[PDB]
Design a protein around this nucleic acid. Structure first.
Lengths: 80, 98, 195, 208, 129, 25, 149, 82
RNA sequence: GCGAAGGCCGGGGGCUAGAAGGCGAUCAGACACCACCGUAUUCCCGGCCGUAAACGGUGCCGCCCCGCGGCCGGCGCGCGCGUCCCGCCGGCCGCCCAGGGAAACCGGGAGGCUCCGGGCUCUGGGGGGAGUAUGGCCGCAAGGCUGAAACUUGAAGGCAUU
RNA sequence: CGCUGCUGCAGUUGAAACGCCCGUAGUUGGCCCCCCGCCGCCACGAGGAAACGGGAGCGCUCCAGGCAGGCCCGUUGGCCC
């Protein structure tokens, strides 16, 4: 294999730490998710530690974690 | 020269270990350096086990085992043959042998 | 240049199954892992290794100058069949320390290039070959040190059927590459090589 | 002469000639005859002889250790070591070893580039035990500026100009002589910009 | 703390050559390291050096052809008189003809051989042989 | 422990000496 | 390395290469600046104002969507913290350990953490005083710290 | 190659081969160093074509064990065998 | 500012061991080891003291550096999916290829160093005299910290090998 | 004598990392703007006693020297520090 640097493997780059990489980059994204009461989609951080409330059901849809925020109500997937 | 990397003790990420005493000598020995061989034996010798087992009027009671952790000081261990002085080559071996 | 139906050749050989510990130097040749732990090599990489060992083999002018060594009992029949096809000197069992560095050794020898069944028990042969500018070519499983091994051949080395087959695929190509035998044609089943 | 190694046969044959072509191929030489065939130099000097002892039930058992440096006055140096119960026998072992470790010396210019090469090709560094040696390229008039033992090695080497610095228990001749040998031996493996250009029948062991 | 960026870059360059690798990545990119690599590339000790844009401090990928023995930095940047550019040559490099000390001068960062002809003296940055 | 026993001996001489200086003030 | 501990850890935040606003995000600079201003009315600290914009709203990076950082927005409105939040947060911690110390006189370990925290307040204050983000008159003492919080 | 003299004639003497993979001069006493050759072959009737590309690998490279990966890589990038 | 133990001071407490003391056996003599009794101490609160083989005999911050493991605390990836697997970050570690070193060995350095220069502090300069004398500072004391000289001497020492 | 170490010493075990942590002076500071202002820096200037040292010429019989000498640069006694 001739795999070299300046042009490295994307899969291999992901496993490496965000800052220990050719370009230090975010490991988190935004999530398009849809609640049980309201079918409109609320954009949320993937690692929100803030209490986040749905624009519809009064209770918060965000459960804060050590890594990626878990959700309490209905879930959509993959923001576009 | 330094004889052992371990320094004769298993202390890692610590500055002090709880003192224990040699069962035979009574010397205070830090827990890390004690020989610590656990033994599970039988309340009576095998030679007496047969006769005691026949004597019991209970239906199914085995001779109940005795559990003790013997912790020995280095000198007590080498004198009583719990551990042996090995060659610089075999000193590294860690697996319980025999 | 992998052909058709290796299921009855290299896959029947069990050459693909290797070992539960993988060396860093063998990572390219190996591909995927089984849940039990075994690592499985890639067969076309082993074909690219078979012809490559044959390339160095057809370079040396006298095949008896090339030697072949094994200490494994299963290996004995295979190296001898490799000796019967290509005319290469055998070194069965113990290579003998000083075989290559002692003139006073009764069997002082100087092979132009060496062939070792594994760096596991044929390791002394690879160390001595280093002292006397002798190349080393060796069949290697996943836990293999490549120190002093100039070229390596991913090879199960565990199954006698695998050791024998590797040699038959290797033996056929060196004769075909010299051109002494016909090439690209329909010969002995490697079963003769295995014991 | 009865040749044994492929090179020993070829050298008598004339198939393989000039030590420089065996050094290019970096092959060991196992018979002093090969060095004798190449060099009809009539220089070999024993650098010191030391008595050595082993305490035993009887007591000390004395054997002698001899170190001999043999050098064709220009371009090849050999330092050898040997032991035995009588000094003469040990001197023979050391001298036959010294030839069996004869090595080329690169020899370049201090900066007065014109005719013959006069100095070491670059800074030369060698280490035997404590002894560490530095050989520095020097102007043509300035000669071999070294201690009498390391100077003998340099004469036998034929490096006309050399500023040497020796650091360690240089009183140990085995180490001082070894350190200069180690420095001179590696002279032909250091890359210099003049060897930066690139390059089977030609091979010396190809002959079969 | 990372006081000398050049030293870290050049030790990585020499450590990669000692193992023998084709590409090395330098964690901090400095315009002085970029110039140092350029002087070495022109002389032919090294090949292409690529400055990846971190958007933070940047990185460098230096291609190694294998011809560099020792490249170092003299710290503190000492002040070299022109009648001393020759004294440094014998203390630092092997042979006057082979090797290059880079010294920063008002004219620019240049190898000592060039400065010696210009009759100028600067402050030494480092030794590449 | 000859070093620990030397220090104790040094101390029992220095205290004697400190007492002697105190007699003359 | 941690200033007051022999501890090495790297748990940083990696800002994206793109410094330009995201496509899904629909907030104009005024829209988020309004949120920042109402969040200051709640009294939320700029570290929280930045977090609230990141999760309830989708503006993960304020400077990408706007042209300035949260405190630059506040300073332009003259609504910035009078004492920079970092010093203020250390001062809360110093008083909190000091309160515990008032009940317990034998927590020598707690006293030690106070010396380290207090040393930071002094170090950050000298920088803040030199930058003039803090009035030159400002002095963190300790006994008077309860009033300063 | 060689160290040229002022007159323009190389003085030096023997010129050492450089290891194909790491370009470290193969020294006179590099007994570990080896210089194997790979045989090029015809399109069909694969046979030795009477010319072998020559590849040198010094003993330091050999000790690392990198020679096997470097040798495979050396052919693929240089074409030749791979 | 903190700082094991022992010690000291003013109180409390007093079981266990147990410096001192006394004792029986020893042995030429043991006053020692061993047996027995036992005061200070041990333990608590409020202060002192400022020492340890206070050790990894290895200052601190930073960089690259070769595999193969174990443990530990987070985090994420895969898969039906189990305290599974692969990684990532941080800590504790074992073995170790180079490299280094007088070796022992170290390799998460003691590597990247006679080819000697990333930054900052501390300390040493043959063995003793001597950590003494004297002055100072500190402590209730014990003593700590600082710290010589006259003079004497050909070795003292390190790590290896018979 | 690299046994004083700027070059250029050593501190795991030979002599030597303070028991720890905070900390002021002191010393040291990531990357970053091509264009100037002040720095330090470096280059070359002037201007600064000879002796001495280096050095030009000169057979005090050689020499240590001394500026002499030979029909002579404006005969010398330059020039460098």
């Amino acid at each position: 294999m001739n795999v070299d640097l300046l042009y490295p493997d994307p899969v291999e780059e992901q496993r490496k730490h965000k800052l220990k990489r050719l370009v230090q980059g975010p490991n988190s994204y935004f999530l398009e998710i849809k609640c049980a009461g309201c079918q409109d989609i609320v954009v949320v951080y993937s690692h929100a530690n803030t209490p986040v409330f749905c624009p519809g059901c009064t209770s918060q849809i965000s459960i804060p974690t050590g890594g990626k925020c878990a959700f309490t109500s209905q879930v959509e997937r993959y923001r576009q | 020269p330094v004889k052992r990397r371990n320094n004769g003790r298993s202390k890692y990420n610590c500055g002090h270990t709880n003192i224990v005493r040699c069962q035979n000598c009574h010397r205070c020995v830090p827990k890390d350096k004690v020989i610590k061989r656990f033994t599970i034996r039988n309340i009576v010798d095998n030679t007496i086990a047969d006769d005691v087992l026949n004597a019991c009027v209970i239906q199914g009671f085995a001779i109940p085992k005795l559990y003790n952790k013997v912790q020995y000081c280095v000198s007590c261990s080498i004198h009583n043959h719990i551990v042996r002085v090995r060659s610089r080559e075999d000193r590294k071996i860690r697996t319980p042998p025999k | 240049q992998l052909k058709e139906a290796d299921v009855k050749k290299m896959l029947v050989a069990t050459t693909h199954l290797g070992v539960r510990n993988i060396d860093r130097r063998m990572q390219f040749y190996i591909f995927d892992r089984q849940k039990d732990g075994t690592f499985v090599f890639n067969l076309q990489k082993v074909w690219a290794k078979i012809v490559f060992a044959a390339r160095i083999l057809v370079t040396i002018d006298d095949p008896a100058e090339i030697a072949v060594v094994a200490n494994r009992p299963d290996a004995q029949r295979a190296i001898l069949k490799f000796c019967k096809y290509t005319h290469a000197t055998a070194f069965p069992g113990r290579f003998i320390p000083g075989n290559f560095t002692n003139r006073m050794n009764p069997n002082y020898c100087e092979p132009r290039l060496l062939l070792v069944n594994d760096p596991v028990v044929d390791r002394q042969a690879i160390l001595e070959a280093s002292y006397v500018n002798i190349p080393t070519i060796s069949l290697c499983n996943s836990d293999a040190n490549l120190k002093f091994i100039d070229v390596a051949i991913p090879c199960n080395n565990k199954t006698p059927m695998s050791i024998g087959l590797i040699y038959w695929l290797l033996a056929r190509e060196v004769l075909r590459l010299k051109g002494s035998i016909s090439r690209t044609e329909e010969d002995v089943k490697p079963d003769l090589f295995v014991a | 002469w009865h040749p044994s190694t492929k090179l020993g046969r070829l050298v008598k044959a004339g198939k393989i000639e000039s030590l420089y072509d065996i050094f290019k191929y970096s092959l060991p030489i196992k018979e002093t005859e090969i060095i004798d065939y190449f060099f009809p130099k009539s220089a070999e000097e024993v650098c010191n002889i030391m008595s050595v002892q082993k305490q035993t039930t009887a007591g000390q058992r004395t054997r002698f250790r001899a170190h001999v440096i043999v050098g064709n006055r220009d371009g090849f140096i050999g330092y050898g070591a040997g032991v035995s119960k009588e000094v003469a026998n040990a001197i023979k072992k050391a001298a036959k070893n010294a030839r069996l470790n004869i090595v080329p010396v690169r020899r370049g210019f201090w900066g007065g580039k014109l005719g013959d090469p006069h100095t070491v090709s670059s800074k030369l560094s060698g280490k035997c035990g404590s002894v560490r040696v530095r050989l520095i390229p020097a102007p043509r008039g300035a000669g071999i500026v070294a201690s009498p033992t390391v100077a003998k090695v340099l004469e036998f080497a034929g490096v006309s100009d050399v500023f040497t610095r020796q650091s360690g228990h240089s009183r140990t001749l085995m180490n001082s002589v070894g350190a200069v040998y180690n420095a001179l031996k590696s002279s032909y493996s250091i890359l210099t910009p003049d060897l930066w250009k690139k390059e089977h029948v030609q091979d010396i062991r190809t002959m079969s | 703390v990372r006081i000398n960026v050049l030293r870290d870059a050049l030790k990585s360059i020499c450590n990669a050559q000692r193992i023998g690798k084709k590409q090395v990545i330098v964690r901090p990119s400095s315009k002085v390291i970029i110039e140092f690599l350029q002087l070495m590339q022109k002389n032919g000790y090294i090949s292409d050096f690529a400055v990846v844009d971190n958007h933070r401090s940047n990185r460098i990928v230096v291609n190694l052809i294998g011809r560099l023995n020792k490249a170092g930095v003299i710290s503190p940047r000492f002040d070299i008189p022109a009648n001393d550019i020759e004294k440094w040559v014998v203390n630092l490099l092997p042979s006057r003809l082979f090797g290059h000390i880079i010294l920063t001068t008002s004219q620019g960062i240049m190898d000592h051989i060039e400065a010696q002809h210009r009759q100028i003296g600067g402050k030494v940055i480092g030794y590449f042989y | 422990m000859r070093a620990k026993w030397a220090k104790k001996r040094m101390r029992k001489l220095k205290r004697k000496r400190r007492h002697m200086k105190a007699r003359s003030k | 390395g941690r200033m007051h501990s022999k501890g090495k850890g790297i748990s940083r935040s990696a800002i994206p290469y793109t410094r330009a606003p995201a496509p899904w995000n629909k907030y104009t600079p005024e829209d988020v600046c309004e949120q920042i201003c109402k969040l200051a009315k709640k009294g939320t600290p700029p570290s929280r104002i930045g977090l609230i914009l990141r999760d309830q709203f989708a503006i993960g990076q304020v400077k990408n969507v706007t042209g300035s950082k949260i405190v630059r927005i506040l300073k332009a409105k003259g609504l910035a913290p009078e004492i920079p939040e970092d010093l203020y947060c250390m001062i809360k911690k110093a008083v909190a350990i000091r309160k515990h110390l008032e009940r317990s006189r034998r927590d020598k370990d707690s006293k030690f953490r106070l010396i380290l925290v207090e040393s930071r307040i002094h170090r950050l204050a000298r920088y803040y005083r030199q930058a003039r983000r803090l009035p030159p008159t400002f002095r963190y003492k300790s006994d008077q710290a309860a009033a300063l919080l | 190659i060689g160290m040229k003299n002022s007159s323009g004639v190389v003085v030096d003497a023997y010129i050492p081969r450089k290891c194909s993979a790491t370009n470290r001069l193969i020294g006179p006493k590099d007994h570990a160093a080896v210089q194997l050759s790979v045989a090029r072959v015809n399109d069909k009737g694969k046979m030795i074509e009477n010319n072998y590309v020559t590849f040198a690998f010094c003993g330091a490279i050999r000790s690392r064990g990198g020679v096997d990966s470097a040798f495979m890589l050396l052919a693929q990038e240089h074409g030749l065998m791979e």
